[PDB]
C-alpha cells in the first residue's frame, strides 16, 4: 500500500502514498502492463465536485471550515437544480495548475505553479475564441521570453454545445501529400491541412506554412482565422560549427501550445483549453525533424556531414542526430527564445520529484514519456523508478472533433 | 479477450491473444502502473498443476497433445511428485524449457535468436570443482574464438532450499572494482561488493582497472569456492576509435562474452538456481551503460576533454557527442577483432520482425518497452514507436536474491 521508488544511480529511495488517492484507471491489470500503449449525470457530478472542493479547501488550510461546508452546500444546490455548476475563479486557477501538476507524462512540471490562467468562460463565438487565442499567444510568447499560460473556454453542458480548437496545437506547419507521391511540409498534419483547404484556406503551399486556426464555438461549424504573423515567433535553425546547415532551410516556432486536450476539474469538462509553456530541444530536433513519419531529415544531414552511411554500425544516424540537436538549442538560445535541453529539464524533474515526495507524498510519472527520445541513460530520469497513476484535476485525450461534429 | 498494439511509425496493428495464457503477476493494477520498477520451497500441493501446464505445452509443441506418450508422462511425473515431492525433467523437456524461458523473456531484445540455444545439462554435477569444469567448457564453446554461440549450463534444481547450487558472480566474466580510501573507485564500481567478498574468500587481487574476477561457486548448499578462469579462455577486445588515435591511450578494453549467472530458471515449477546463460553484446550495453553510466566507468568527461568539446554548458550536448564516439569505438573494436557484436539499430530492427512473426505464429510476444528501447538514440530505433504488451509466461528467468544475503555459512 505504501510503495517505494528507487533511483539506481543514487540509491535514493522515496515512499509513495499519494497514489492511494488515485481516482482514475491506468490500462494495466495484475496480468498485463500497458505502460507503453499511447492511450489505454447529476449524481456522478456531486461526488466529483466534493472530492475536488475537499482538496481545494485542504490546500488553503480551511478544510472543514464554515466557508468549506457552505461552498459544498451551494454547489450541491446548484447541481441539484441546474445539473451542473460554475467554479469560482480561485477554484478554476487551482484546478488548472493541478491538472498540470498531475500530468504524469510531463517532464516540465517543476514549473507547475507559475501558470497564468486566462478565464475565457464568457466567450460565445469563434471570433471571440480567436481574440482570446491571439491574446494568449502574445502573452505567452512575450518576445521570446516565454511564459506558461492556459486559456479556458466554456465547459461542456449537454455535449451538443462544445467549444473546440480543431488544431492539435495553436501553431503548427501545414502538410501536403503531393502528386509527386511524397509529402511537403509536416506529414503529421496532412489530414488537418486538407480539412483546412476543404474549408476554404488558401495554402501558400510551402514547407513551413503556419496553419490557420480553425475554431468551434458553442457546437457550431468551425471557422478559419490566420494568426497575425507578428504574433508567431519563429527561429531559423543554424549550427554553431556547420555553415551548410542553414541551407537545409529549417525553421521552428517558439511556442508549443497544445490545443486538442480536455481539462477535467471537479467533474466539469473543458473541451477547449489550449495551454502553452516552452520546448525541450529534443521535441523539435529528435522527434519533429528526425521521426521517419515527420520532417525525416537525418539522411540529408548525414550526407552534408559526409558520414559513412554504408552500414548502420558507423552510427551515422546517431552522430547526425546530436548535431541537429546542438543546432536547435544554439539557434533558440542565440535568438533569445526560451528552450530547455534534456539534460537540464530532466535534472529539474528529479528535483521536482524530490519536492513532491517530500511535500505531497508523491509524484505520478510516466517513465515511457519522461525519458527523452535520445541519450536516455545519460539523463538522471533513466535511472529513476517512477509510479504512474491518474489523479484529478487532469488533462485527458479526446477524439479529433471532425470524428464527432455534426455539420 | 483480444488486445491490440499499434506501431505509430508504420500504423501496423497486431492482436494479442497469448496474454490469456499468462499466469504470474506484473506488479501493476487498474490503479497503478509499475512498468518502470526494476523488481516489482514449493509443496506437491502447488507443484502438480505447474508440472501439468508445462507438459501440456511441451506436448502441444511436439504435436503429441493427448497422446498416450503425453498421458504416461503425466502419470509418471505425478507419481514421482507424490513419492519424492519433486520430479526430474527429461533432456528434451529441459532443452525445450530453457529455450522457452528465453523466448518468454520480455526484457530481451535479442529473442529472434531464441531457437538456437546450446543447452548444457549439468544436472549430474555435485561439487564446485565440477561446476568450474562445466563453466569453463561453456565459456570455451560459447566464445568459439570470437564467433559467439548462445548457450546455457543447467546445474541441479532446488530440492529443500538448503542444498542450492549458485554462481555467486553476477556474470561469469566481469571486472573487479576496488573502493579506495579516498572515496574513488578503481575498476568497475558495479562490482565493488562482490570483489570484496572474493578478497575476503582469499582471492589475491591484482588491483588494476581490468582484473577478471574469480568464479565463486556454491554446490549443493555448501560454502562457495574460488577458481580462476584460465586467461586463455577469456576473450578480450582493446577499445580503439577509427578516427581518434588518442582513444587507445584511454586504456580501455572489454570482455567479448556476456554471460549472466545470477538468475533463476523456472520450468514446470522446478527451480534451477544456477543456470548461467550467454549470448553476445549489443554495443550500447558496453558503450552507453558500462562506460558512461555515472555509477560505472564514467569516461564521458575524459573522452569529452580529449575531443575538446565545450564542457561549460550541458546545451552544447558534449555528453551526447562523446557518448556516440565511445559507442562507435566499441563497435569498431569488436568488428575489427572479429568478435560478434550487434549495434542497436540492427538489433531493434530484428526484434520488430521477431515480434511481428511471434504475433502471427504464437498469438503474441510479451515485451517490456522500458528495457527493449536502447539507452541512447531511442526514437531513431523502430522499437521506440512500437506499442508492446508486458506479461509473464513460464518457463521463465526470474531474479533471486544475491546469495551472500541468504546463505547459511557452514564454516
Ligand atoms: C513550461 C515548459 C514546459 C516544458 C519544457 C514541458 C515539457 C513537456 C514534454 C517534453 C512533454 C512530452 C511531449 C511530447 O513528447 O509530445 C510534455 C507532455 C505534457 N505536458 Fe508539459 N512541459 C511544459 C509546460 C506544460 C504546461 C504549461 C502544461 C499544462 C498546463 C503541460 C502539460 C503536459 C501534458 C498534459 C502532457 C502530455 C501530453 C500527452 O499526454 O500527449 N506542460 N511536457
Ligand atoms: C544472442 C544474443 C543476445 C543479445 C544481443 C541479447 C540482448 C539483450 C540486451 C541488450 C538485454 C538488456 C540487458 C541489460 O540492460 O542489462 C537483454 C536482457 C535479457 N536477456 Fe537477452 N540477448 C541475447 C541473448 C540472450 C540469451 C541466450 C538469453 C537466455 C537464454 C537471454 C535472456 C535475457 C533475459 C532473461 C534478460 C533480462 C535481464 C534482466 O531482467 O535483468 N538473452 N538481452
Ligand atoms: N507527431 C505525431 N502526431 C501528432 C500530430 C499532431 C499533434 C501532435 O502533438 C503531440 C502532443 O504534443 C505535446 C503535448 C504536450 C507538450 C508538448 N510540448 C511542449 N513543450 C508543450 C506544449 C504545451 C505546453 S509545453 C507537446 C502529434 C506523430 C508522429 C508519428 C505518428 S503520429
Ligand atoms: N550495472 C549495475 N549492476 C550490475 C552488476 C552485475 C551485472 C549486471 O547486469 C544487469 C543485467 O545484465 C544483463 C542481463 C541480460 C542480458 C545482458 N546482456 C546480454 N547481451 C547477454 C547476457 C547473456 C546472454 S545475452 C545483460 C548489473 C548497476 C549500475 C547502477 C546501479 S546497479
Ligand atoms: C528505473 C528503471 O527501470 C531502470 O533504470 C532501467 C531502465 N531501463 C533499462 N533498460 C535496460 N535494458 N537495462 C537497464 O538496466 C535498465 N534500467
Ligand atoms: C508506443 C510508445 O509509447 C510511443 O511511441 C511513445 C513513447 N514515448 C514517448 N514519449 C514522449 N515524450 N513522446 C512521445 O510521443 C512518445 N511516444
Ligand atoms: Zn503497468
Cα distance between residue A84 and residue A156, in whole Å: 10
Contact between B153 and B245 under an 8 Å Cβ cutoff? The reply is no
Q: Which residues of B touch A38 (CB under 8 A)?
A: 6, 8, 387
Closest ligand to the CA of A26? 7
Contact between B154 and B120 (Cβ < 8 Å) = yes
Contacts of A359 (CB under 8 A, 6+ apart): none
* Best CA proximity match to B278, nearest among B118, B85, B405: B118
**Closest residue to B32, CB basis, from A6, A26, A377:** A26
Check CB contact under 8 Å for B370 and A35: yes
In a domain, A364, yes or no: yes
Taking the mean position of all CA atoms in its chain, how far away is CA A151? 13
Angstrom distance (rounded) from CA B347 to CA B243 = 25
Contact status, residue A41 vs residue A48, Cβ threshold 8 Å:
no
A75 and A180 assigned to the same domain: no
Question: CA-to-CA distance for B92 and B95, rounded, in angstroms?
Answer: 5
What are the residues whose beta carbons fall under 8 Å from the beta carbon of A69, sequence distance 6 or more? none
C-alpha cell at B129: 570443482
Do the domain assignments include residue B286?
yes
Do residue B370 and residue A367 have CB atoms under 8 angstroms apart?
yes
Tell me how far CA of residue B262 lies from CA of B25, B165, B331, B401, in angstroms: 21, 11, 27, 8
- The residues facing B397 across adjacent strands are B265
B98 and B168 assigned to the same domain = no
Give the residue on B whose Cα is nearest the Cα of A313. B343
Helix (H) or strand (E) holding B317: none
How far, in Å, are A186, A187, A329, B270 from residue A332 at the CA level?
20, 24, 5, 59
Quick one: cell of A52?
Answer: 475536488
DSSP three-state, residue A81: helix
- Classify the C-alpha dihedral A370-A374-A377-A379 as positive or negative: negative
Does a structural domain hold residue A101? Answer: yes
Atom of ligand 1 nearest to the CA of A96: 30
Angle (deg, nearest 10), helices B44-61 and B68-84: 160
Which positions in chain A touch B30 (Cβ < 8 Å)? 25-26, 28-29
H-helix segments, B85-161: 91-103, 128-143
Q: Is residue B7 part of a domain?
A: no
In order, the DSSP letters of A218-272 are TT---EEEPPPGGG--EEE---SS-GGGGGG--EEES--EE-S-EEEETTEEES-
Q: Is the CB of A291 under 6 A from ligand 5?
A: no
Residues in chain B: 411
- Find out whether B214 and B198 touch, Cβ atoms under 8 Å: yes
A335 touches chain B (CB under 8 A): no
| Residue B320 CA to ligand 7 centre (angstroms) | 30
B361 in the same domain as B306: no
How many residues make up chain A in this entry? Answer: 407
Q: What residues pair up with B120 in beta bridges, in sequence order?
A: B153
- Of A327, A344, A361, the domain-final residue: A344
- Is position B9 annotated as part of the catalytic site? no
| Contact between B329 and B337 (Cβ < 8 Å) | no
Q: How far is CA B124 from CA A294, A342, B165, B166, in A?
A: 58, 54, 12, 15
CA of B188 from ligand 5 middle (Å) equals 18
C-alpha angle A15/A21/A23, rounded to 5°?
135
In contact, A402 and A166? CB cutoff 8 Å: yes
Same domain, B268 and B359: yes
> Strands B236-238 and B253-255, how do they pair?
antiparallel
Q: In chain A, how many H helices and how many E strands? A: 11, 16
What end-to-end distance do the CA atoms of chain B give, in Å? Answer: 55
Cβ within 8 Å, pair B314-A367: no
| Residue B323 counted as domain residue | yes
A278 is catalytic: yes
The CATH number covering residue B221 comes to 3.90.440.10
Same domain, B53 and B30: yes
Chain A (91-110) residues lying within 8 Å, Cβ to Cβ, of chain B: none
Residue A324 structural domain: 234-256+279-344
Inside any domain, residue A44: yes
Alpha helices in B62-113 (DSSP H): 68-84, 91-103
Same domain for B176 and B189, yes or no, is: yes
Which residues on B lie below 8 Å from A389 (Cβ)? 31-33
Breaks in chain B listed by the residue before each, with C–N > 2.5 Å:
40
Examine residue A326 and state whether it is found in any structural domain, yes or no. Answer: yes
CB neighbour list of residue B60: distance below 8 Å, 6 or more residues apart: none
All cell numbers assigned to A401:
472533433
Nearest to B283 by CA among A302, A318, A368, A290: A318
- Residues B220 and B183 grouped into a single domain: yes
For residues B95 and B235, what is the distance between their CA atoms, to the nearest angstrom? 27
- Are A92 and A46 part of one and the same domain? yes
Total domain count, chain B: 3
Size of interface A-B (CB pairs under 8 A): 203
Distance from Cα A8 to the centre of ligand 5, integer Å: 9
| Sheet containing B264-267: order of strands | B270-272, B264-267, B396-398
Q: What is the CATH number of the domain that holds A34?
A: 3.90.340.10
List the single best residue of A378, A383, A390 to mutate versus B (max B Cβ within 10 A).
A378
B20 → chain A, closest CA residue: A31
* Residue numbers in A near B19 (CB within 8 A): 31-32
Closest by CA position to B108, among listed B335, B355, B327, B340: B355
Chain A residues within 8 A of B378 when measuring between CB atoms: 371-374, 376
Q: Is the CB of B285 under 6 A from ligand 2?
A: yes
Sign of the dihedral defined by the CA atoms of residues B217, B283, A374, B309, in that order: positive
For ligand 3, mutation pick of A97, A255, A258, A372 (most atoms within 8 Å of CB): A258
> Which runs of consecutive H residues, i.e. helices, occur in A85-200?
89-101, 126-141, 190-197
Both A327 and A361 in a single domain? no
Q: Give a yes or no: residue B224 inside a domain.
A: yes
Which atom belonging to ligand 3 lies closest to the Cα atom of A288?
1
Q: What angle separates helix B318-336 from helix A316-334, to the nearest 10 degrees?
A: 170
- Whether residues B343 and A34 touch (CB distance < 8 A) is answered with no
Q: In the structure, which protein residues have their CB atom closer than 6 angstroms to any atom of ligand 4?
A: A 8; B 110, 170-171, 190, 258-260, 277-279, 281-282, 285, 293, 295
Q: Which of B37, B324, B343 sits opposite A322 (nearest CB)?
A: B324
Do B190 and B221 share a domain, yes or no? yes
Alpha carbons B191 and A33: distance in angstroms, whole number:
32
CA B186/CA A160 separation, integer angstroms: 69
Active site residue B123: no
On chain A, the residues whose CB falls within 8 A of the CB of B379 are: 286-287, 290-291, 373-374
| Alpha carbons B172 and B174: distance in angstroms, whole number | 7
Give the containing element (helix H, strand E) for B196.
Answer: helix B192-200
Hey, are the CB atoms on B30 and A34 less than 8 Å from each other? no
Contacts for B34 with CB less than 8 Å, ≥ 6 apart: A33, A387, B26, B27, B28, B40
Q: How far apart are CA B312 and CA B293, in angstroms?
A: 20
**Active-site residue among A278, A356, A363, A367?**
A278
Q: Which residues contact residue B71 at a Cβ distance below 8 angstroms, ignoring those fewer than 6 apart?
A: none
Q: Is A377 on the interface with B (CB under 8 A)?
A: yes
Judged on CB neighbours under 10 Å (0-12, 13-18, 19+), A320 is buried
Residues A297 and A239 in one domain: yes
Cell of A230: 507578428
Does residue B70 contact residue B58 with C-beta atoms inside 8 Å? no
Beta carbons of B307 and A321 less than 8 angstroms apart: no
**Is B404 annotated as a binding-site member?**
no
Asked if residues B54 and B77 have their Cβ atoms less than 8 Å apart, the reply is: no
CB-CB contact of A52 with A95 (8 Å): yes
Backbone dihedral angles phi then psi of residue B69, each to the nearest 5 degrees: -60, -40
Q: Both ends of chain A: CA-CA distance in Å?
A: 50
- Is A169 annotated to bind a ligand? Reply is yes
What's the CA gap between A238 and A334, in Å, rounded?
10
Beta bridge partners, B238, equal: B253
Residue A229 and residue A286 share a domain: no
Amino acid at each position: 500500500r505504501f510503495l517505494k521508488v528507487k533511483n539506481w544511480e543514487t540509491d535514493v529511495v522515496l515512499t509513495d502514498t499519494l497514489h492511494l488517492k488515485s481516482t482514475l484507471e491506468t490500462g494495466c491489470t495484475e496480468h498485463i502492463c500497458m505502460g507503453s500503449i499511447m492511450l489505454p449525470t447529476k449524481d456522478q457530478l456531486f461526488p466529483l465536485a466534493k472530492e475536488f472542493l475537499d482538496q481545494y479547501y485542504s490546500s488553503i488550510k480551511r478544510f472543514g471550515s464554515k466557508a468549506h461546508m457552505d461552498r459544498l452546500e451551494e454547489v450541491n444546490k446548484e447541481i441539484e437544480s441546474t445539473s451542473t455548476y460554475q467554479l469560482k475563479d480561485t477554484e478554476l486557477i487551482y484546478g488548472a495548475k493541478h491538472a498540470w501538476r498531475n500530468a504524469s507524462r510531463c517532464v516540465g512540471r517543476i514549473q507547475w505553479s507559475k501558470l497564468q490562467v486566462f478565464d475565457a468562460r464568457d466567450c460565445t463565438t469563434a471570433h471571440g475564441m480567436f481574440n482570446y487565442i491571439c491574446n494568449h499567444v502574445k502573452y505567452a510568447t512575450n518576445k521570446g521570453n516565454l511564459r506558461s499560460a492556459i486559456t479556458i473556454f466554456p465547459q461542456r453542458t449537454d455535449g451538443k454545445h462544445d467549444f473546440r480548437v480543431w488544431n492539435s496545437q495553436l501553431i503548427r506547419y501545414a502538410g501536403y501529400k503531393q502528386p509527386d507521391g511524397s509529402t511537403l511540409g509536416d506529414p503529421a498534419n496532412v489530414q488537418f491541412t486538407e480539412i483546412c483547404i476543404q474549408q476554404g484556406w488558401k495554402a501558400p503551399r510551402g514547407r513551413f506554412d503556419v496553419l490557420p486556426l480553425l475554431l468551434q464555438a458553442n457546437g457550431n461549424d468551425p471557422e478559419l482565422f490566420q494568426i497575425p504573423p507578428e504574433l508567431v515567433l519563429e527561429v531559423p535553425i543554424r549550427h554553431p560549427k556547420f555553415d551548410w546547415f542553414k541551407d537545409l532551410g529549417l525553421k521552428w516556432y517558439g511556442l508549443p501550445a497544445v490545443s486538442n486536450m480536455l481539462l477535467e476539474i471537479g467533474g466539469l469538462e473543458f473541451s477547449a483549453c489550449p495551454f502553452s509553456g516552452w520546448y525541450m530541444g529534443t521535441e523539435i530536433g529528435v522527434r519533429d525533424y528526425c521521426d521517419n513519419s515527420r520532417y525525416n531529415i537525418l539522411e540529408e544531414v548525414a550526407k552534408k556531414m559526409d558520414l559513412d552511411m554504408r552500414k548502420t554500425s558507423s552510427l551515422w544516424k546517431d552522430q547526425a542526430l546530436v548535431e541537429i540537436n546542438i543546432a536547435v538549442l544554439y539557434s533558440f538560445q542565440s535568438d533569445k527564445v526560451t528552450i530547455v535541453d534534456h539534460h537540464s529539464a530532466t535534472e529539474s524533474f528529479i528535483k521536482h520529484m524530490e519536492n513532491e515526495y517530500r511535500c505531497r507524498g508523491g509524484c505520478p510519472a510516466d517513465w515511457v514519456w519522461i525519458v527523452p527520445p535520445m541519450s536516455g541513460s545519460i539523463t538522471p530520469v533513466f535511472h529513476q523508478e517512477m509510479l504512474n497513476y491518474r489523479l484529478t484535476p487532469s488533462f485527458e485525450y479526446q477524439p479529433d472533433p471532425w470524428n464527432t461534429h455534426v455539420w
